[PDB]
């Protein structure tokens, strides 16, 4: 019990530093290399920047919440930082959805190929939708005293009770349910296209990696679930009893196992891009000595 409780922060720091290394390598490739920049690759850089902003915003806040007792920031912090975290999560989810849609359109319709401006305006609209959905997270959030106590930055007023339950499903629908249901059917169509073109010889090696990719795009859905479902169920459980805080061991271990998996998206994408793509693999291997 205590052993794994002390080990969990070690694995958390390991995942955090691995995600930081992945993001810095991705931005170094997209900045200091003109060979990996193209039309469909701008979304990869956008997702890398989003995950880097997430690791730079949420991680210090979680460290201060798990290491200190009071809120180190003022009113401007409680007004800005949660909005930044929410819009970063939103733009990351939307960029993953856009990548899934692009892969679907490229694989299912290979013979369906100006596009640079389209991708740029799509990324701009994604960022706009992400920063517009984080507006209500600022007015309803304030530094209030929770129920020998202290104060904290909470997103819901302690007076009303229906608004937290409404905002819970509002966040769970547009951020988790719809994006997951979209990427699931997209990856399913991708796998169906990769299987029908391979199965019901000069195609003994290409079909092997084709089946490998068709399996990886299906495991992507399970990874997305295993990474996002714990945080969402934790948020939904907190929304029902936001006034009645639970300092027990069960709530603590649930929060830990939810955070260590919500922070796993900063490592799922770099590892997948390293094990699938070959153009980025050589760059990752060459940037091991330079940084």
């Amino acid at each position: 019990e205590l052993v794994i409780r002390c080990v969990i922060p070690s694995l958390y720091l390991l995942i955090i530093t691995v995600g930081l290394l992945g993001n810095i390598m991705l931005v170094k490739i997209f900045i200091t290399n003109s060979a990996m920049r193209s039309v469909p690759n701008i979304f990869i850089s956008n997702l890398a920047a989003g995950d880097l902003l997430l690791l730079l915003t949420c991680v210090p806040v979680d460290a201060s919440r798990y290491f200190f007792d009071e809120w180190m920031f003022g009113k401007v912090g409680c007004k800005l930082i949660p909005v930044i975290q929410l819009t970063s999560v939103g733009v990351s989810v939307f960029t993953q959805t856009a990548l899934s849609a692009d892969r679907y359109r490229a694989i299912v319709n290979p013979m369906d190929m100006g596009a640079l401006l389209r991708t740029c305006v799509k990324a701009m609209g994604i960022w706009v939708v992400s920063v517009l959905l984080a507006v209500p997270e600022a007015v309803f959030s304030e530094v209030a005293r929770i129920s020998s106590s202290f104060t904290a930055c909470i997103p819901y007023p302690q007076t009303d009770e229906l608004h937290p339950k409404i905002h819970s499903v509002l966040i769970f629908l547009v951020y988790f349910l719809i994006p997951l249901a979209i990427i699931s059917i997209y990856y399913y169509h991708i796998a169906k296209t990769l299987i029908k073109s391979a199965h019901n010889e000069h195609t003994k090696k290409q079909m092997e990696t084709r089946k490998r990719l068709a399996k990886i795009v299906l495991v992507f859905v399970g990874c997305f679930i295993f990474c996002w479902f714990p945080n969402h169920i934790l948020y939904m459980y907190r929304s029902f009893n936001y006034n009645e805080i639970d300092p027990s061991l069960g709530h603590m271990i649930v929060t830990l196992v939810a955070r260590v998996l919500s922070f796993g998206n900063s490592c799922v994408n770099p590892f997948a891009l390293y094990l699938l793509s070959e153009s980025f693999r050589r760059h990752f291997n060459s940037q091991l000595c330079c940084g």
Partner: peptide, 9 residues
């Protein structure tokens, strides 16, 4: 404690 609060993260 303080870890019982937060904004989706």
């Amino acid at each position: 404690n303080l870890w019982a609060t937060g904004h989706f993260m």
